[PDB]
UniProtKB/Swiss-Prot annotation:
It catalyses: 5-amino-1-(5-phospho-D-ribosyl)imidazole-4-carboxylate + L-aspartate + ATP = (2S)-2-[5-amino-1-(5-phospho-beta-D-ribosyl)imidazole-4-carboxamido]succinate + ADP + phosphate + 2 H(+). PROSITE patterns: SAICAR_SYNTHETASE_1, SAICAR_SYNTHETASE_2. It comes from the Bacteria. This is Phosphoribosylaminoimidazole-succinocarboxamide synthase. It comes from Mycobacteroides abscessus (strain ATCC 19977 / DSM 44196 / CCUG 20993 / CIP 104536 / JCM 13569 / NCTC 13031 / TMC 1543 / L948) (Mycobacterium abscessus).
Length: 295
């Protein structure tokens, strides 16, 4: 008999994820079906999104050779029935307070920083880059969490040194770029560009660096369709473009510039979005989502 979720103590909530204490050395890392667009958690869940993203993260953890915080299999008996397939048993770590971001392509706040200053997180870039320009080598563009509801703040390497130590900062930079490079090459071979990604790491009892959180989901990474990669324009979000187009289209009745909470999504848009998640997962993993565990 699997325990109830109510047997565990809630310790943290994010926009679409939850964290529970299992015992002194283990946590339960829970993905929900909530989706975020335009910095709003939308009213409408995407069915199976939590399970699909958990499956994705597990696949990429298995692909990468680096130590990670997984502490049991996806069907570990400590996982409650209610969250089966969308929750993982993980080791409790001392988390390092750095959002470790790699960018293979220039977009979002990286592009904006570049357009304002010619530099991103201390990296002075070549002239003449623009939206969705390829960056080679990939850039380490660390950030720190800001206040509630606020965007992460881009920082330079010196800031990372000040947060975690000089040797550790070097390690975060090197591992972030190595891990991103491996995953991005794998995805591209399968027809998906991972344009960028965000990692968190923690440290175990021995002082060892351990990859934590979730890895290479479409929430932690910009997924693009490689077959439509066109430098110089904004690339479609592989997973979220239907949602974005509907919300800013004529049928939603919503004005994005108003910054009022957006309306619920059509069921059809939610189902189409689920399909995009499954497509991305199956193309990258070579597995069938119908084989992924659930309640
Ligand atoms: N992963 C991990 C982890 C760990 N293995 N040990 C200790 N702490 C953490 C931890 C603490 N906060 N967060 C991020 C934010 N949470 C994420 C999801 O739930 C919402 C909040 C990660």
């Amino acid at each position: 008999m699997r325990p109830s979720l109510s047997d565990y103590q809630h310790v943290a909530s994010g926009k679409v994820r939850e964290l529970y204490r299992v015992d002194d050395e283990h946590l339960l890392f829970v993905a929900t079906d909530r989706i975020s667009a335009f910095d709003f958690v939308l009213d409408t869940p995407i069915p199976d999104k939590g399970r699909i993203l958990t499956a994705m993260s597990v696949f990429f953890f298995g692909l990468l050779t680096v130590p990670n915080h997984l502490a049991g299999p996806p069907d570990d008996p400590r996982i409650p029935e209610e969250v089966l397939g969308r929750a993982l048993l993980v080791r409790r770590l001392d988390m390092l307070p750095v959002e470790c971001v790699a960018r293979g392509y220039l977009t979002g706040s990286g592009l904006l920083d570049y357009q304002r200053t010619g530099a991103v997180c201390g990296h002075v870039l070549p002239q003449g880059l623009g939206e969705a320009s390829r960056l080679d080598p990939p850039l380490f563009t660390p950030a720190t969490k800001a206040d509630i509801g606020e965007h992460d703040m881009n920082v330079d390497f010196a800031a990372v040194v000040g947060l975690v130590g000089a040797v550790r900062a070097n390690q975060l930079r090197d591992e972030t770029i190595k891990i991103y490079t491996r995953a991005a090459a794998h995805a591209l071979h399968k027809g998906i560009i991972l344009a960028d990604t965000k990692f968190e790491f923690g440290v175990d009892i021995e002082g060892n660096l351990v990859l934590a959180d979730e890895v290479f989901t479409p929430d932690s990474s910009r997924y693009w369709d490689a077959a439509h990669y066109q430098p110089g324009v904004v690339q479609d979000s592989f997973d979220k473009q239907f949602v974005r187009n509907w919300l800013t289209g004529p049928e939603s009745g919503w004005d994005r510039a108003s910054d009022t909470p957006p309306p619920p999504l059509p069921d059809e848009v939610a189902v189409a979005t689920r399909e995009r998640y499954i497509e991305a997962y199956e193309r990258i993993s070579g597995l069938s989502f119908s084989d992924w565990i659930g309640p």
